[PDB]
Design an enzyme around this catalytic site. Structure first.
Site, PDB file in Angstrom:
ATOM      1  N   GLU A 171       1.959  14.044 -14.716  1.00 13.21           N
ATOM      2  CA  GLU A 171       2.638  13.588 -13.500  1.00 13.21           C
ATOM      3  C   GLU A 171       2.299  12.132 -13.225  1.00 13.21           C
ATOM      4  OE1 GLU A 171       2.861  14.397  -8.660  1.00 13.21           O
ATOM      5  OE2 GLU A 171       1.823  15.814  -9.976  1.00 13.21           O
ATOM      6  N   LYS A 209       6.345  15.615 -15.076  1.00  7.98           N
ATOM      7  CA  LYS A 209       6.622  15.705 -13.643  1.00  7.98           C
ATOM      8  C   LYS A 209       6.804  14.277 -13.128  1.00  7.98           C
ATOM      9  CE  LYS A 209       5.174  17.777  -9.256  1.00  7.98           C
ATOM     10  NZ  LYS A 209       4.427  18.870  -8.573  1.00  7.98           N
TER      11      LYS A 209
END
Lengths: 339, 339, 340, 339
Positions: free
Chosen positions: C183, C225
């Protein structure tokens, strides 16, 4: 993954060391046809080969100036030229224990995707050219990278291209017997202050010595030709002592002691400013494990060119002016210049 | 720092995609004079311009062969040459909606301090040369980087120099209207197995796309010419299905889907080995967001050249031989080749 | 200098792929004590463990909601908690073929010498912690790097530190059986336009996939992500179709097809904005060799938490609200969400 | 992008310089419970807190030994411990103008995908811990990165992780008032020769000083703790003069003169070998713009522990043994040790 240990190793180390003889510096007479054009236009003289060969003869045969010079940088044309009496310029040099040098880069081109940043041309065929220049009596070379200071400049891309460009050039020089002068020039243009130029200089010089190590360069057979650390063209100047401290500090933080000498470029500084700045640096108390000397072109010649004004009558008074500038700067390399 | 958004953007995108029209690939007929001389020396043929021009006209004017070709890579000499009847070779192609391409690199030189590793020459004056080649009708370019597999090879230095060399080349092409083919070839020499070649290919391809991003290349107007992933010269061979899986996996792990097409190189593979491998890959089940097609030299020409033997009598049979290899490889791009 | 081929390789590939099953996404219910304390005070609810456990049971036991979820991200406390009647939360999930996931980073600290930029803490003892969470039933992990867009930001230092932090984290997960969610979030703060965030996003993703390769990560057992590509907080909004095309383009240019799925973060988007954007992306013409699905936190639970207001009586209609949002987002991953 | 300009800058600079006061070095007494348990297991002494506190008071309270020491590295337990008479160990040092130092790393763990290479743990919460150590009187820190020499080692991955770990650690220390000692230890293990260790040492030091510049570290408030350059453990030894030349050359080529001192680690060298090598380096002709001194653990302590054998009666003869080692090494830093 050793650094350069080839057949030229001992000679590269010896000659690099000699360029750093205290009291001696480098005369930069490696102007282009184009650059000497405007140097000749300020003295209202036409740019003919005869007048260029004359100015070079005028400098190189000034009585006594070669006591103060360890090397002379030549444009390729001049490397093969002679005095009026038929003596090769390199023979004049070898007899006065001066080393001839040669500019080997091919100028700059813009880097795609940047805001006016440059990379430097020349690596194509560089090894073959360098072996030929050694056969002609050259013993060191010069390559000029240019970086600018702006909002987002130097960019990371600019810094990597110029650092790896310089390292690539340096190791090819050493393989063909030429001591490479590493010139990372940060332009003074702009309104920044001396602290921003201190940071950019330190980042750039650190980038360069990493690249040289990555490319296996033998540092003891190299030289460094950096800008001094100064405010921008458009900012207020500072005292010469301040320039000296910031400049020697950037050097302390980035340059390995194995490199024998720094040969400063003057940029657009007046003849006296350059000599003063260089003196103030060799006066500083502090660690300076390398010679701090000059590689001056405009900063040695401009007053001589004006006295000459392209006349043969004036050779005698111009040569004295050049001999005085050579003594002043040689005293500046020793901390003994007094104005 | 965006990627290339200049005037040639839309044309680069369309032309790159067109190279990947299904059923079509690329003929590499870009051997230099030196190179084509030892092909001609094998069939006891004189290496003079008239024989080079005749070989290329024989190829380019094989009836029907240009249905199977999206582009043809030329040497600079051939780019300006004509058919016997006075038709420029680029006119022949443009009429058959084939894109002419131009080789722009200047061969390899050893990297100082490595164990026989290379960098590739050519960046000096590349932009001007490309602008000139665009005006002559070329629309894509080729630059070949070489990497070898050994005890400590490819080195970290070799990988950065060839990857940033490719990126520096790629962006110059795009500014001048040429679609850059990125060609990082890993040589098959050695006793290594397919897994060592799988690792090296993945490392190298990752280095190249990182470089292309650093240099702001517009990935949608580019192409890739990678080696297939195969065991070494000196190791036992593996089934064509294994070669296919390892190769498509390496691409799956490294190549962004924005790149429209792969044009595989054949190395020293036989004419048939190349086709079988190319077919096995297009039959493999798995994510393939890019056309998997060919850019073959030796693997399209070798038998045509031997059949011709430099005589005008043999032209018709040699052209039939050449059309056979063009159809076969066109089927391999579609998974319809059957031996 | 092989990529990860250890004992968990097949399972990582199976589980990473499963997360990208069409019609399913990830519930991010991994708020810390501090963080859930700051949405509990918005609905006037006391922040003690029994209220946290009650909220999580309300989510995980909504009838039918786990039809729409392939995975759920947990905070460490919740990994070991049970329903009121004594069934472990991981067992609830395992019965619904949902994979439990665990947040493993330890938040951000300032990067010395930068202009308010961050690195993320957590690598010390990460391997042991992951081995322990795997035995507790987790099968994927989450680590959040943060980057800002400013005059000189993100810096080269920030890009290198966060990219290599993510890569070093990712390979440790794989060695201990956890599928790493990578992420790298680029914050929306500032007056920049959509083109400036396209550039930074493309630069940051290229950095992360290069770092991932340097560290020998097995990409087929990973997930991404990323932020969606949007104008800045302080700039004009643009049509949802534009956000979609810029975002799918950034991915096309940087994310290898071996990574099986994208699990978008919503940032501060409204619950509806997130679903619209996620739907517009799956309708687009173009190459998408990876699942484009969700990993939403606030964007699945905001209205559910208000409806609940911390009351046993409101559970019924709170669960109805949450099932609606799970249904809408599940439709959006298919290009079939139609408003409301 | 300036280097560290905070409140601690002048103090960090003054103390780092103090560490290199001529005739003084660093005693490394920062063994863990586990580590000191392996020293105690050899002299049959119980590894309990009161015996650890006893050995450290025996060292720190040797009459005259703190004349030879500028700093002492402690384990966290010892930073808070007292003499038998209740006097804090930090106070004993401060009274003899010795700087307390603290180890801040959390040991090593293996790097996935390598052949037993390590990265070093410790960054989590490093800032908070360093601020608590400062209020407790510590003024410099220690972090140990380890690199091994093999077929493919050190790896590019290993070099980046350990160089950036040190730089990341270095800047956090400076922000909280501790002088960071940068310790990239290249292990002697293996059959390599002295040249392979010269190459690996030079590469590694170059990476760390570039990493240090990347992370904006104030070099003038740092120290370096490098291996000496030696053949591998498993290879034939070379003369101590040779070790000296290779070691000083490695530093000249990589370490900026802004760093005030080198504090050598001894590896597995005998007490006498360490002293001989360190003396030989300070006798060498050459540029040495930095103090070449010691940071010795086993090489100051081993014979003292053996004489002590954990008894209170033996304190007086052991302290005599320790004082002899402190004077030999103190003389070695000045070129005066004669056996």
């Amino acid at each position: 993954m050793s650094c350069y240990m080839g057949k030229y190793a001992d000679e590269l180390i010896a000659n690099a060391a000699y360029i750093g003889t205290p009291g001696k510096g480098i005369l930069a007479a490696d102007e282009s046809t184009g650059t000497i054009g405007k140097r000749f236009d300020s003295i209202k003289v036409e740019n003919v080969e005869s007048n260029r060969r004359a100015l070079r003869e005028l400098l190189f045969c000034t009585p006594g100036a070669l006591d103060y010079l360890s090397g002379i940088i030549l444009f390729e044309e001049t490397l093969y030229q002679k005095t009026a009496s038929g003596k090769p310029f390199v023979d004049v040099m070898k007899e006065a224990n001066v080393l001839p040098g040669i500019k080997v880069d091919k100028g700059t081109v813009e880097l795609a995707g940047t805001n006016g940043e440059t990379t430097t041309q020349g690596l194509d065929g560089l090894g073959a050219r360098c072996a030929q220049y050694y056969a002609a009596g050259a013993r060191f070379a010069k390559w000029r990278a240019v970086l600018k200071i702006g909002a987002n400049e130097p960019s990371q891309l600019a810094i990597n291209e110029n650092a790896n460009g310089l390292a690539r050039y340096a190791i090819i020089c050493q393989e063909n017997g030429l001591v490479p002068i590493v010139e990372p020039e940060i332009l003074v243009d702009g309104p920044h202050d001396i602290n921003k130029c201190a940071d950019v200089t330190e980042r750039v010089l650190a980038a360069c010595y990493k690249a040289l190590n990555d490319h296996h360069v033998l540092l003891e057979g190299t030289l460094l030709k950096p800008n001094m650390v100064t405010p921008g063209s458009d900012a207020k100047k500072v005292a010469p002592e301040v320039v000296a401290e910031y400049t020697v500090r950037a050097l302390q933080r980035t340059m390995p002691p194995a490199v024998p000498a720094v040969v400063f470029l003057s940029g657009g500084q007046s003849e006296e400013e350059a000599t003063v700045h260089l003196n103030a640096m060799n006066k500083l108390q502090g660690k300076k494990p390398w010679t701090l000397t000059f590689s001056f072109g405009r900063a040695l010649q401009q007053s001589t060119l004006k006295a000459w004004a392209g006349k043969e009558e004036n050779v005698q008074k111009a040569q004295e002016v050049f001999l005085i500038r050579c003594k002043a700067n040689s005293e500046a390399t020793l901390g003994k210049y007094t104005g």
